[PDB]
């Protein structure tokens, strides 16, 4: 569900990346390292309608802490603001068969490659490279049923 959030960060209007960048410089009014820590997140959560626990505070930052600093900088803050603005596992199974054309129980490359060429869009060689290994998270060459779910989480 991660690389579905960088797609909202990539498509934020710069008229939105002003309001968030502004609301971030306020968010950090008082921080040394210039970034949201537990102190600055304590404030705007309880002074918004909560009272979160400091061991649970670090669990909202460490979800976007792609830096391990315990601090949510700006680029880590939009990833926080997109997690707060899918498709059912029963529906992705009836769709899992339309991929599996040979009806084996997997989705080897030539079954993914053909579903891609049917999209009407223009397909490249590098698109099918990253995508096949976005699902084949063990490089067996196929996307079993469990993988096809963690693959398509939240895909509208």
């Amino acid at each position: 569900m991660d690389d579905i959030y960088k797609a909202a960060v990539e498509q934020l209007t710069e008229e939105q990346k002003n309001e968030f960048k502004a609301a971030f410089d306020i968010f950090v009014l008082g921080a040394e390292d210039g970034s949201i820590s537990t102190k600055e997140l304590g404030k705007v959560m309880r002074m918004l309608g909560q009272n979160p626990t400091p061991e649970e505070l670090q669990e909202m930052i460490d979800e976007v802490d792609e830096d391990g600093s315990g601090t949510v900088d700006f680029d880590e803050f939009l990833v926080m603001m997109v997690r707060s603005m899918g498709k059912s596992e029963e529906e992705l199974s009836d769709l899992f068969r339309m991929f599996d054309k040979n009806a084996d129980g997997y989705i080897d490359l030539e079954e993914l490659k053909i579903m891609l060429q049917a999209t009407g869009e223009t397909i490249t060689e590098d698109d099918i490279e990253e995508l096949m290994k976005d699902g084949d998270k063990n490089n067996d060459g196929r996307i079993d049923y469990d993988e096809f779910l963690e693959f398509m989480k939240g895909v509208e």
Partner: protein, 105 residues
Amino acid sequence: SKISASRKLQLKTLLLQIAKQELEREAEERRGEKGRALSTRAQPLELLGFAELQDLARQLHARVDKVDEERYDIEAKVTKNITEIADLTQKIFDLSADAMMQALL
């Protein structure tokens, strides 16, 4: 990454856009496959001699008792398969933001 993560999402969103189409039409090659096989099996009636018409209703009366028995022994295979799926599925199973911008700007 060799491509943007918004094209990767644009492509993911486009595969499922035709998989429901490839299913909404698979459920139409099947809606017809029914009606076609529902005129080979249950050929519609057409009318007879008051007496030698009765030997047809008795053939229909026992046709049903044959059909609903054919329909049972396939049901008890569908039923026994549903029992096995849950027996299989249970095994494998064992293995804010908008409120912030308003209070900051």
